[PDB]
Amino acid sequence: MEELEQGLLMQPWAWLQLAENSLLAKVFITKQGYALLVSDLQQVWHEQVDTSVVSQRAKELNKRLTAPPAAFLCHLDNLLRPLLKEATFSCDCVADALILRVRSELSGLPFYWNFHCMLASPSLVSQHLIRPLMGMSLALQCQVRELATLLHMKDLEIQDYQESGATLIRDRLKTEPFEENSFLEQFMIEKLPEACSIGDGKPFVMNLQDLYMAVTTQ
Amino acid sequence: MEELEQGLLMQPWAWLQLAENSLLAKVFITKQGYALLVSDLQQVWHEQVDTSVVSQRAKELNKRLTAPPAAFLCHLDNLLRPLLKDATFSCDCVADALILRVRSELSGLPFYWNFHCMLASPSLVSQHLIRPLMGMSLALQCQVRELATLLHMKDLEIQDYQESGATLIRDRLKTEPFEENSFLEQFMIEKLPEACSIGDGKPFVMNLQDLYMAVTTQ
Amino acid sequence: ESEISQEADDMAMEKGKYVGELRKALLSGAGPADVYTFNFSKESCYFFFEKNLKDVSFRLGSFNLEKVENPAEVIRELICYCLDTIAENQAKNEHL
C-alpha cells in the first residue's frame, strides 16, 4: 500500500542479482506486502504489492509447493536476506508483466516465485521511476556543476600558489586544469558503456543510494 | 521502417511552447510519420503514427482545406523539434491520449487541429524514462565520483601548498582542507531535497537533456 | 507425498533445512527453536510438526500414519530390539 510505496521512496535501489538483465530493483520488504520496483531497461513497472497479492503472485507460478499468505510474505522477506536485503534470481524480460523467475528452493522440490511488477501506467511511473530517479539525477547534475566550479576556484588558488611558490610535492595527485565539459566528454568515453549499457547497475546503487536516502522529498 | 522508435531512443528533449502547462513533447518527425514521446517526467505519451494517418487526421480536422499530405508533412516537420509548427500548442495531460492542439490559423474562419498521442509504449518509455535515464543517472553518479577524486586531489594540492610555504595571505577568503564527503553531506540535506524538482519537464531540458543526448547511444 | 512438499514454504526458510528437519523428526532429534513439535494425534494416527512464527502458523512438516490393529506388535518388536542390543552391548563390553 501507500506505506510500502513510501518505504520504496525511502528504501534504496538494489539490483536483482541474477546476472541476466539490468533488473535494477528498489528493495523495500516490510510486512503486509513489500515494494520491489524492478525495471528491465525496456519497460516500466511499479511493484507496490501487498501481502495478499504477494502470496497470489507466488502461487501463480507454483504448482505443488505453497504456504499461508503471511507465510509467503515472510518467506520472500527471507528470500532477499542472503543476496538482496533463496539466493537464486532470474526473470523473463520479454513478458509485459515483469515475472522475476526467482526459483528459490525450500524443500528440494521446485518453488516458483515471481516479483511480478504491475505494469506502470504513464501516471504510475512518476511515483518512483522519475521522482527519486530524476531527483537524484538532477541532484547529481547540481553536484557536477558545484564540484566543477569548486574545482575551478581551487585550481585558481593552486595556480596562485605556484605563482607565489614553485614547489612541487607529489606529482601523483597533481590535478590537471579542470574543465567541466572536458570532464563530461572524457566520461562519455569509458564510463558510457557502463552508463548506456547498465548491465548490473551495482555502480548505480552503491553510489546513488546515498542520494536515494533523501530524494524522497517529492 | 521503425525509425520512429529509433528516433525515439536518441529523441532530443525539446520544450513544447504552450498557453498551458508546458510538457516535454519530444518527437522525431519523419516523412513516414513520427513518434511523439511526450515525456514531461510527469506522464508519458507516444504518437506512433505514420505520415498518411496524421496527414489525413489534419485534413479531416481542418474543416475546409484543399492541401496535399506533403503540405501537412512539412507542417509536422516544423515540429521535428517541437517548439512551434504553425498556432500555439496546448496539451491534454489528463489521460493516456495527449491532445496536442495545433490551431492552423492565419486570420481566416474557425479551425482546430490537434495531435493524438495514444498510450505510451513502455519499451520506448524506458528508452526515455528508464534505460537512457538509468544510463545518464549512473553516468552523473560516477561523474560525481571522478569529481570526488578531482576535488580530493585539488584539496590536498592546496593544503600541501599551504604548509610547504608561499601560503596565501588572504586568510579571510581561503578554504579549509576540503573533501568530497564534506560536499556530499551538505548536498544530501540541502540541495538533493530541492534539486529533486521533477517539474513539467523543464528541469530535464535545463540540466538533464544535454547529458541524455550524451547517452543516447543506447 | 503431498504432506512432504508445501511444508517447506510454510517454515519458509530456504532449501536444505527442510529435508533434514523432516528426517530428524522421523529419526532422533528435535531442536529447541527448530522444534519438530510432535503434533501426533495418537487416536486418529496423524503426525505433523509446525515451526510457527512470522505472522502466521508455519506447518514445518507433516507425516501421516496408519494405526496398527494390534498396538503391542511393533512395541514388542522395538523393545526386543532394545534388549537384544543391550545384551550384545554387555557381552561385547566384557570382551572389550
XYZ file of C-alpha atoms in Angstrom:
532
model
C 0.000 0.000 0.000
C 0.979 3.660 0.359
C 3.117 2.661 3.346
C 5.086 0.330 1.080
C 5.154 2.965 -1.673
C 6.654 5.481 0.758
C 9.143 2.915 2.036
C 10.108 2.321 -1.583
C 10.505 6.099 -1.858
C 12.991 5.946 1.039
C 14.432 2.426 0.937
C 17.123 2.295 -1.732
C 17.539 0.680 -5.122
C 19.241 -2.720 -5.196
C 19.849 -4.626 -8.424
C 18.329 -8.077 -8.740
C 21.338 -10.392 -8.524
C 20.502 -12.595 -11.500
C 23.353 -11.592 -13.867
C 20.941 -11.865 -16.814
C 19.302 -8.457 -17.337
C 19.620 -4.970 -15.873
C 16.728 -5.608 -13.471
C 17.544 -2.690 -11.183
C 15.163 -3.235 -8.282
C 14.276 -0.964 -5.366
C 14.132 -3.040 -2.186
C 11.507 -2.275 0.459
C 10.384 -5.530 2.086
C 8.185 -4.744 5.095
C 5.132 -6.536 6.489
C 1.742 -6.541 4.717
C 3.497 -6.855 1.368
C 6.664 -5.237 0.036
C 7.861 -2.840 -2.658
C 10.406 -4.291 -5.093
C 10.188 -1.949 -8.079
C 12.120 -3.724 -10.837
C 12.913 -2.089 -14.190
C 14.311 -4.122 -17.092
C 15.572 -1.114 -19.140
C 12.884 -1.895 -21.755
C 9.648 -1.450 -19.759
C 8.351 0.440 -16.723
C 6.819 -1.114 -13.609
C 5.618 -0.370 -10.080
C 5.512 -3.394 -7.763
C 3.584 -1.750 -4.929
C 2.277 -5.117 -3.783
C 0.565 -6.131 -0.543
C 0.804 -9.465 1.248
C -2.334 -10.869 -0.412
C -1.218 -10.078 -3.957
C 2.320 -11.061 -2.915
C 1.112 -14.539 -1.987
C -1.158 -14.911 -5.011
C 1.723 -13.962 -7.321
C 3.863 -16.527 -5.503
C 1.128 -19.112 -6.114
C 0.513 -18.150 -9.761
C 3.765 -19.865 -10.769
C 3.789 -22.511 -8.028
C 2.195 -25.887 -8.718
C 2.720 -28.196 -5.720
C 4.586 -26.150 -3.067
C 2.553 -23.472 -1.276
C 2.178 -21.637 2.038
C -0.164 -19.366 4.032
C -0.316 -15.744 2.803
C 1.814 -14.235 5.562
C 3.977 -17.351 5.257
C 4.616 -16.472 1.614
C 5.275 -12.855 2.576
C 7.836 -13.609 5.282
C 9.334 -16.323 3.062
C 10.006 -13.778 0.328
C 11.323 -11.413 3.004
C 13.818 -14.129 3.973
C 14.470 -14.682 0.259
C 16.248 -11.337 -0.124
C 18.134 -11.771 3.171
C 21.261 -13.576 1.850
C 21.558 -11.853 -1.540
C 19.454 -8.665 -1.818
C 18.374 -7.458 1.636
C 16.850 -18.426 -1.603
C 19.662 -16.502 -3.310
C 18.598 -17.538 -6.826
C 17.362 -14.900 -9.272
C 16.025 -14.984 -12.833
C 13.316 -13.421 -14.984
C 11.763 -13.203 -18.447
C 12.455 -9.766 -19.924
C 10.006 -10.379 -22.788
C 6.923 -10.581 -20.552
C 4.812 -7.438 -20.239
C 4.459 -8.178 -16.525
C 7.933 -8.475 -15.036
C 7.769 -12.113 -13.930
C 11.030 -12.276 -11.976
C 11.638 -16.015 -12.232
C 13.026 -16.253 -8.695
C 13.367 -20.030 -8.366
C 14.304 -20.114 -4.694
C 14.154 -23.595 -3.185
C 12.860 -24.623 0.232
C 12.057 -28.346 0.085
C 14.375 -29.712 -2.569
C 11.186 -29.608 -4.678
C 10.648 -26.726 -7.122
C 9.246 -23.474 -5.769
C 8.310 -20.668 -8.152
C 8.470 -17.039 -7.032
C 7.973 -14.044 -9.300
C 8.479 -10.446 -8.215
C 5.558 -9.743 -10.535
C 5.647 -5.991 -11.060
C 2.464 -4.204 -12.071
C 2.862 -2.513 -15.439
C 3.403 1.145 -14.588
C 0.989 3.457 -16.350
C 2.426 6.798 -17.525
C 0.887 8.192 -14.334
C 2.378 5.373 -12.234
C 5.953 5.982 -13.441
C 6.123 9.372 -11.695
C 5.916 7.714 -8.264
C 9.330 6.038 -8.317
C 10.885 5.762 -11.788
C 11.016 9.562 -12.076
C 10.657 11.386 -8.752
C 13.546 9.591 -6.979
C 15.492 8.673 -10.128
C 15.253 12.108 -11.727
C 15.537 13.729 -8.303
C 18.915 12.114 -7.719
C 19.836 12.733 -11.367
C 19.204 16.475 -11.083
C 20.990 16.316 -7.731
C 23.984 14.733 -9.473
C 23.864 17.408 -12.177
C 23.937 20.096 -9.485
C 26.741 18.158 -7.783
C 28.710 18.131 -11.035
C 28.197 21.872 -11.531
C 29.068 22.782 -7.928
C 32.073 20.453 -7.814
C 33.199 21.859 -11.169
C 33.099 25.481 -10.023
C 34.755 24.448 -6.750
C 37.465 22.693 -8.774
C 37.921 25.837 -10.857
C 38.291 28.139 -7.845
C 40.558 25.643 -6.059
C 42.698 25.453 -9.202
C 42.808 29.256 -9.217
C 44.124 29.031 -5.655
C 46.568 26.322 -6.771
C 47.879 28.493 -9.616
C 48.221 31.381 -7.171
C 50.326 29.015 -5.074
C 52.656 28.112 -7.949
C 52.951 31.795 -8.869
C 53.806 32.520 -5.222
C 55.871 29.355 -4.752
C 57.194 26.973 -7.409
C 57.274 24.000 -5.023
C 56.278 20.612 -6.429
C 55.413 17.943 -3.869
C 53.984 14.652 -5.121
C 53.062 14.891 -8.839
C 50.823 11.840 -8.237
C 47.610 13.644 -7.257
C 48.681 16.751 -9.197
C 45.381 17.697 -10.801
C 45.083 18.763 -14.400
C 43.435 22.145 -15.058
C 39.842 21.002 -14.705
C 37.163 21.649 -17.318
C 33.583 20.553 -16.675
C 32.796 19.921 -20.348
C 36.102 18.122 -20.919
C 35.356 16.003 -17.849
C 31.901 15.143 -19.192
C 33.295 14.251 -22.624
C 36.100 12.089 -21.221
C 33.445 10.427 -19.059
C 31.230 9.727 -22.099
C 34.056 7.551 -23.495
C 34.853 4.776 -21.000
C 32.013 5.054 -18.470
C 29.396 5.477 -21.203
C 29.294 1.676 -21.766
C 28.769 1.500 -18.008
C 26.090 4.179 -18.392
C 24.224 3.327 -21.603
C 24.675 -0.435 -21.168
C 23.859 -0.547 -17.460
C 24.383 -4.293 -17.203
C 24.427 -4.818 -13.456
C 23.640 -1.374 -12.077
C 25.665 -2.130 -8.928
C 27.736 1.046 -9.507
C 24.396 2.865 -9.675
C 23.128 1.545 -6.342
C 26.175 1.515 -4.077
C 26.877 5.112 -5.211
C 23.382 6.674 -5.561
C 21.507 5.110 -2.660
C 23.056 7.871 -0.547
C 21.123 10.298 -2.754
C 18.117 7.981 -2.530
C 18.117 8.321 1.266
C 16.966 11.953 0.916
C 15.459 12.157 -2.589
C 12.014 11.224 -1.142
C 11.224 14.914 -0.567
C 8.842 14.956 -3.537
C 10.918 1.399 -41.171
C 10.851 1.518 -37.351
C 12.886 4.737 -37.359
C 10.140 6.264 -35.203
C 11.350 4.198 -32.247
C 14.991 4.593 -33.301
C 14.372 8.323 -33.415
C 12.695 7.813 -30.035
C 15.835 6.473 -28.343
C 18.020 9.401 -29.427
C 14.973 11.703 -29.302
C 16.071 15.235 -28.337
C 14.062 16.738 -25.495
C 12.502 19.939 -26.846
C 10.391 22.162 -24.608
C 6.938 22.492 -26.156
C 5.605 26.062 -26.301
C 2.114 26.232 -24.794
C -0.512 28.583 -23.483
C -0.995 25.882 -20.812
C 1.235 23.719 -18.605
C 4.144 23.079 -20.968
C 5.214 19.439 -21.282
C 8.277 17.911 -22.936
C 6.500 16.768 -26.069
C 9.507 15.444 -27.989
C 9.280 13.772 -31.385
C 11.318 12.710 -34.397
C 9.059 13.898 -37.219
C 9.747 11.716 -40.259
C 8.443 11.627 -43.810
C 6.647 8.404 -42.782
C 5.054 9.751 -39.612
C 6.633 10.247 -36.204
C 6.691 9.127 -32.573
C 5.809 11.919 -30.131
C 7.013 10.528 -26.800
C 5.702 13.340 -24.620
C 7.919 12.863 -21.553
C 7.498 15.805 -19.187
C 8.735 13.477 -16.404
C 5.116 13.515 -15.166
C 3.145 11.490 -17.731
C 4.481 9.669 -20.790
C 2.755 9.701 -24.179
C 3.590 8.301 -27.614
C 2.136 9.192 -31.023
C 3.026 6.079 -33.029
C 1.538 7.320 -36.294
C 2.589 7.180 -39.938
C 2.551 10.120 -42.330
C -0.688 9.051 -44.024
C -2.763 8.739 -40.849
C -1.554 12.006 -39.305
C -1.913 13.848 -42.624
C -5.484 12.605 -43.053
C -6.114 13.492 -39.398
C -5.077 17.062 -40.184
C -7.175 17.116 -43.360
C -10.282 15.841 -41.558
C -9.746 18.198 -38.606
C -9.218 21.120 -40.993
C -12.860 21.872 -41.740
C -12.477 23.143 -45.335
C -8.925 22.507 -46.544
C -7.510 21.773 -50.001
C -3.954 20.721 -49.154
C -1.666 17.843 -50.135
C -0.443 15.408 -47.466
C 3.075 16.731 -48.114
C 1.942 20.208 -47.041
C 0.973 18.915 -43.614
C 4.064 16.693 -43.648
C 6.145 19.879 -43.806
C 3.788 21.359 -41.201
C 4.805 18.421 -38.989
C 8.498 18.727 -39.885
C 8.168 22.218 -38.429
C 7.616 20.271 -35.173
C 10.650 18.000 -35.714
C 11.956 19.857 -32.697
C 8.571 20.507 -31.076
C 8.779 24.256 -30.466
C 6.233 25.705 -32.919
C 4.893 24.066 -36.082
C 2.372 26.636 -37.358
C -0.861 28.028 -33.627
C 0.456 27.845 -30.081
C 0.370 24.345 -28.642
C -1.853 23.018 -25.869
C -1.544 19.615 -24.200
C -4.210 17.482 -22.524
C -2.345 15.879 -19.612
C -5.387 14.001 -18.312
C -5.234 10.551 -19.931
C -3.044 8.207 -21.986
C -4.016 10.183 -25.121
C -2.351 13.604 -25.268
C -4.261 16.156 -27.343
C -1.529 18.484 -28.643
C -3.694 21.221 -30.129
C -2.257 22.996 -33.189
C -4.775 25.595 -34.370
C -3.998 26.080 -38.068
C -4.814 29.792 -38.061
C -3.674 32.549 -40.421
C -6.525 35.050 -39.877
C -9.500 33.380 -41.603
C -12.509 31.449 -40.304
C -12.545 28.945 -37.394
C -10.136 25.992 -37.249
C -8.972 23.362 -34.773
C -6.283 20.711 -35.304
C -4.694 18.569 -32.607
C -2.434 15.578 -32.066
C -3.489 12.257 -30.524
C -0.591 10.748 -28.562
C -2.100 7.408 -27.579
C -0.800 5.201 -24.771
C 2.974 5.370 -24.490
C 4.788 2.196 -25.484
C 6.571 1.059 -22.291
C 9.604 -0.048 -24.311
C 10.127 3.478 -25.627
C 9.074 4.814 -22.232
C 12.155 3.041 -20.899
C 14.017 4.380 -23.942
C 13.386 7.852 -22.498
C 12.212 7.282 -18.899
C 14.274 4.301 -17.716
C 17.043 2.945 -19.920
C 18.971 6.083 -21.008
C 17.689 7.806 -17.860
C 19.178 4.966 -15.845
C 22.237 5.453 -18.029
C 22.592 9.188 -17.504
C 21.869 8.789 -13.783
C 24.698 6.265 -13.422
C 26.852 8.477 -15.652
C 26.214 11.525 -13.469
C 26.881 9.462 -10.343
C 30.239 8.116 -11.489
C 30.928 11.639 -12.761
C 30.432 12.813 -9.180
C 32.784 10.019 -8.081
C 35.532 11.053 -10.501
C 34.861 14.609 -9.335
C 35.351 13.261 -5.811
C 38.809 12.151 -6.908
C 39.445 15.523 -8.580
C 38.268 17.533 -5.557
C 40.354 15.379 -3.221
C 43.434 15.953 -5.371
C 42.850 19.716 -5.503
C 42.217 19.897 -1.742
C 45.427 18.021 -0.990
C 47.231 20.236 -3.514
C 46.048 23.435 -1.820
C 46.753 22.066 1.659
C 50.217 20.665 0.923
C 50.922 24.026 -0.712
C 49.866 25.858 2.463
C 52.227 24.085 4.877
C 55.067 23.936 2.311
C 55.400 27.729 2.128
C 54.036 30.539 -0.033
C 50.726 30.352 1.822
C 48.149 32.882 0.654
C 47.943 35.993 2.838
C 44.155 36.409 2.454
C 43.166 34.112 5.305
C 39.620 35.508 5.336
C 38.754 34.117 1.872
C 40.688 30.828 1.810
C 39.122 27.386 2.208
C 39.633 24.788 4.909
C 41.028 21.348 3.982
C 38.169 20.160 1.802
C 36.886 16.728 0.824
C 34.132 15.352 -1.379
C 32.189 13.811 1.505
C 32.031 17.244 3.147
C 30.260 18.437 -0.009
C 28.001 15.380 -0.239
C 26.864 15.534 3.400
C 25.619 19.099 2.940
C 24.224 18.272 -0.508
C 22.112 15.350 0.739
C 20.360 17.623 3.242
C 20.208 20.932 1.331
C 20.376 20.528 -2.448
C 19.312 16.911 -3.046
C 15.880 17.567 -1.444
C 15.485 20.678 -3.627
C 17.415 19.501 -6.686
C 14.733 16.810 -6.610
C 12.497 19.009 -8.788
C 10.682 16.927 -11.395
C 8.622 19.826 -12.752
C 6.864 19.839 -16.106
C 9.889 18.509 -17.968
C 11.721 21.842 -17.929
C 14.205 20.595 -15.265
C 15.143 17.898 -17.788
C 15.891 20.321 -20.627
C 17.796 22.693 -18.352
C 20.099 20.087 -16.751
C 19.341 16.528 -17.937
C 18.726 16.846 -21.687
C 22.374 17.575 -22.524
C 23.837 14.535 -20.773
C 20.897 12.498 -22.055
C 21.962 13.433 -25.584
C 25.437 12.389 -24.466
C 23.963 8.984 -23.501
C 21.520 8.477 -26.394
C 23.969 5.888 -27.767
C 21.963 3.147 -26.036
C 3.577 -37.395 -0.640
C 1.558 -34.155 -0.575
C 2.453 -33.787 3.123
C 6.139 -33.538 2.143
C 6.270 -30.593 -0.298
C 4.411 -27.441 0.774
C 5.582 -27.582 4.407
C 8.927 -26.021 3.443
C 7.225 -22.859 2.211
C 5.322 -22.905 5.495
C 8.528 -22.994 7.547
C 9.594 -20.628 4.717
C 13.376 -20.893 5.046
C 15.409 -21.922 2.020
C 16.272 -25.441 0.887
C 18.448 -27.948 2.721
C 16.880 -27.205 6.092
C 13.503 -28.772 5.290
C 14.736 -32.234 4.254
C 16.983 -32.539 7.297
C 14.166 -31.301 9.528
C 11.821 -33.960 8.155
C 14.433 -36.689 8.591
C 15.370 -35.651 12.132
C 11.675 -35.569 13.006
C 11.401 -39.115 11.647
C 14.704 -40.057 13.291
C 16.007 -38.986 16.703
C 16.450 -35.284 17.378
C 14.465 -32.082 17.866
C 15.791 -28.545 18.189
C 14.820 -26.018 20.865
C 13.784 -23.345 18.349
C 13.660 -25.570 15.248
C 11.483 -27.974 17.240
C 9.522 -30.603 15.340
C 6.555 -30.200 17.663
C 5.193 -33.740 17.584
C 1.531 -32.948 16.989
C 0.780 -36.662 16.633
C -2.890 -37.271 17.343
C -2.479 -40.699 18.924
C -6.036 -41.925 18.371
C -6.523 -40.544 14.846
C -2.975 -41.594 13.855
C -1.667 -38.423 12.209
C 1.768 -36.952 12.938
C 2.816 -33.435 11.983
C 5.164 -30.741 13.242
C 4.864 -26.986 12.747
C 7.574 -24.395 13.442
C 5.116 -21.500 13.568
C 6.301 -17.876 13.525
C 6.323 -14.741 11.352
C 2.710 -13.534 11.308
C 1.038 -16.935 10.641
C 1.348 -20.607 11.553
C 4.192 -22.386 9.740
C 3.449 -26.074 9.203
C 7.079 -27.201 9.226
C 6.327 -30.846 8.478
C 3.502 -33.380 8.328
C 3.729 -37.181 8.196
C 0.526 -39.234 8.280
C 0.473 -42.774 9.679
C -1.806 -45.851 9.782
C -2.644 -47.202 13.246
C -1.670 -50.842 13.703
C -4.546 -53.167 14.579
C -2.564 -54.723 17.430
C -0.616 -51.951 19.209
C 1.543 -54.420 21.131
C 3.141 -55.793 17.935
C 5.657 -53.148 16.878
C 6.096 -52.118 20.521
C 7.292 -55.644 21.293
C 9.444 -55.537 18.156
C 11.134 -52.298 19.233
C 11.638 -53.352 22.854
C 13.022 -56.758 21.860
C 15.424 -54.923 19.553
C 16.417 -52.778 22.543
C 17.023 -55.807 24.780
C 18.945 -57.589 22.015
C 21.244 -54.599 21.583
C 21.562 -54.378 25.386
C 22.722 -57.995 25.637
C 25.069 -57.508 22.682
C 26.481 -54.384 24.342
C 27.142 -56.182 27.629
C 28.750 -59.252 26.027
C 30.914 -57.237 23.655
C 31.825 -54.932 26.554
C 33.171 -57.782 28.658
C 35.205 -58.935 25.614
C 36.357 -55.267 25.320
